[model samples]
Target: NSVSVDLPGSMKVLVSKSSNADGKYDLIATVDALELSGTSDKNNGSGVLEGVKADASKVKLTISDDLGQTTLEVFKSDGSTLVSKKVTSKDKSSTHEKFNEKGELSEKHITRADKSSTHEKFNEKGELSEKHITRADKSSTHEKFNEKGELSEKHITRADKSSTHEKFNEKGEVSEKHITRADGTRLEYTGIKSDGSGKAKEVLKGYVLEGTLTAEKTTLVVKEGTVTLSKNISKSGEVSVELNDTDSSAATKKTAAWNSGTSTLTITVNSKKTKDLVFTSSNTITVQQYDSNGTSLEGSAVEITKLDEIKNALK
Candidate 1:
């Protein structure tokens, strides 16, 4: 008896059995593919098998193009998909797809020309559920999704070991963020608005900094030791800063202002020792001393009319 089975592509199978003069049968089998072929040796009816077993747990098929690009697909023994991979010779980028035992797609991965890769996984419903990406620089990002396929959380880790984690609300808006630096500094941001405004607070060993961010302005308060600095920036590019010395008995305060449009800056000191207002402009500068009663001191006003004079005074 003889049997032959031919596949459409480059695959075929052949089996043959012959009866010997002793009334015994001898069997042989051959399986062939484009890139793989095997043959089984003669098997006698006496239960002695000497040929290669054609039992394959997994089978792989590949296709190639003229440009040297190839696509490979793998299948399990039960005809369920195992993996599929595609590679391009031009840039050496590759993509891989993995399937579950039920032949459903489970995950997909892509490698870029820069050697960075991204892996994405899908839920049983075929919805994107999670993703992880690694960069060539060793930085990586991971993201997770909710049952509704909405992004729920994201985390990024840099090469320097600094990292950031963000959580999203059900509406897909960022709800909170936590960031840490390599220097052991950490920051937390929450109460974010749709307009990109948020509040952030940072704590270090000896200092605490808190701030509010808006679309066009920001405010920061820095407290360290016995000193506190409050900074504010307006939407129109005006800057204001107030510095206070908490250990001083006289409640010493200093204010600084900068006008972006006119390219001018002013510093005012209010203290029991010295009270002065210094104004610096593009072409001129003035220093005026004040008394406890807010009146200008006699003969204390100095105006530098020339830029060279101002530069010299600064020096």
Candidate 2:
């Protein structure tokens, strides 16, 4: 039996006995304790190691707290270190090794906090048959790979910087990409194939168009209704009608046509309505027509003529 104590701080005790009654050690009990000061300004703790026995090939330590408890096991082989493993309340595990079958340190692993990452090595033939390092950074990154030996996905994070993600296809090509800021919105880019000289296509609102135009063509585009002076012109440059939707009038010009051999004449009404309708002369000639209601009617109207007048006019 062995006893050890740290005054006002820690204490440890070990007791062992042989069940065979031969006074040889076969079992042992170990206990460790720590004392903590509860003062507001100075909180501290001390630890103790207890209950160590002989001929023991393994040791396990258990820890408990308000949140949870955990167990750790340190293994030994022929008085040399072999492996160490841990188990936590969340069923999460960690394992470490110091040497391999050939006495080589081939692996080391630790998983705690939150995020996990791993590292591995391969031979000259790119055959990854062993692990080299495994670590977790609660503040930065989490990563994992698929069984097909492809980097399937990853999550990277950092304070005051943009977070990023990468995803790979079966052929190891980066098929998808996403970038996110601390505010949680993400911008993404997708890959596609196109027949044009451009390598990829950008899809917006389901319409596919050429990024560059090198041809001449009339394109009918639909736009919102607008206010403008409207006009209708005949093929012979005759002003058929005009509308003033914007408080303004437009002008038109027509060509006159005539044929004397056929005893025919054509009249083309080419008129422009402007505010300055005047002639330079001391005596003004004003042409005005009025009705009782102050309304004026101008221009020609269709009329029915007798056959006798037509024969007399033709002669």
Candidate 3:
């Protein structure tokens, strides 16, 4: 005996049965087909008879086109649905999905055309638990979630061998991020609050600098070498510049003010010789010598020598 049923959406289901030697009808085979709407691919198949039960045994199915294919398998245990697996392939990419004991989707893996892949797992509650992605360029990213399904940690490694690690708070806000580069440089950002406030600092070979919220003041401490200020400091706070004296000579302090309007640097040294150094923004240096010790011959010669030292220093 054969039975056929017509369904909506231009679909049909067929079942076939045969009479055994004892004269009882036994299930043989079944097939289902649907008219493809958009494309030219049509679905049709036929096979030999066999002992079959629709509700007991597992079944595998496939669908295909010129460009891609999809496969699905249904698994049963104790005459009940246990799990299912589905795979899809298109061009150079493919995706696979697996179901849990409750028939809920539990995991997925995707491979892209670029040879990159991503894997994801879900908790029993159907919430995402972990995710990992690897790129074709040898870079990758991994993410983790807490029991409450909140994002907890994420790490990314770049092609240049640099890496960044981020941690999230209970409210799913980024709390900290640390980065290390291949050149041995590092950066750390912390103090991130729920309201979108944070602080960050960077460290290089011999210097460490940090900044804060109040007035954008950055403090940098050098481990070696001299620190020279090439520009004016305009902040309204305590400004101090300390110089190391290796020769134990008397520490002398001199002040020089550059008048941009007049293109002159009025410099005073030892409270005796006040010299006007004329220079433009292009750093072209020329000096006007002065004599305060009443010995014009000796004082002028000393000032001219000092002017040459300043010019070389500027260069």
Q: Rank by TM-score, highest first.
A: 1, 3, 2
Q: Count the clashes in each prediction.
A: 1, 2, 0
Top-scoring candidate (TM-score): 1
Q: Give candidate 3's error at residue 307 in angstroms.
A: 39
lDDT digits (tens) for residues 183-294 of candidate 3: 6666666887666455656554444445331222223221122212122111332222222212222333334566756655554444544565553332233456556751
- Candidates in order: C-alpha RMSD to true structure: 13.8, 24.9, 14.6
lDDT of 1 by residue, 168-252 (tens): 9888888887878676767677898888689966544444557986766666665554555555545552545455555554344
TM for candidate 1 is 0.50
For each candidate in turn, the TM-score is 0.50, 0.29, 0.44
Candidate order by lDDT, decreasing, is 1, 3, 2
Off by over 4 Å in 1: 1-56, 63-67, 83-91, 131-143, 154-165, 178-186, 193-198, 203-206, 211-218, 222-228, 232-240, 244-315
**lDDT of model number 1:** 0.57
Model 3 TM-score, all chains together: 0.44
lDDT of 1 at 170: 84
Candidate 3: C-alpha RMSD to true structure equals 14.6
lDDT, candidate 3, equals: 0.52
Model 2 lDDT per residue over 1-315, tens place? 322221211222122322234533222223232221111111111121112224443444433322143444444544345444444444343444334443344444555445463444433344444442323433455454656655766667665455666666676766554556454433343451131111122121223212211112111111112222111212232222222222132323222233323312222222422111111121111122223333333443222133232122111
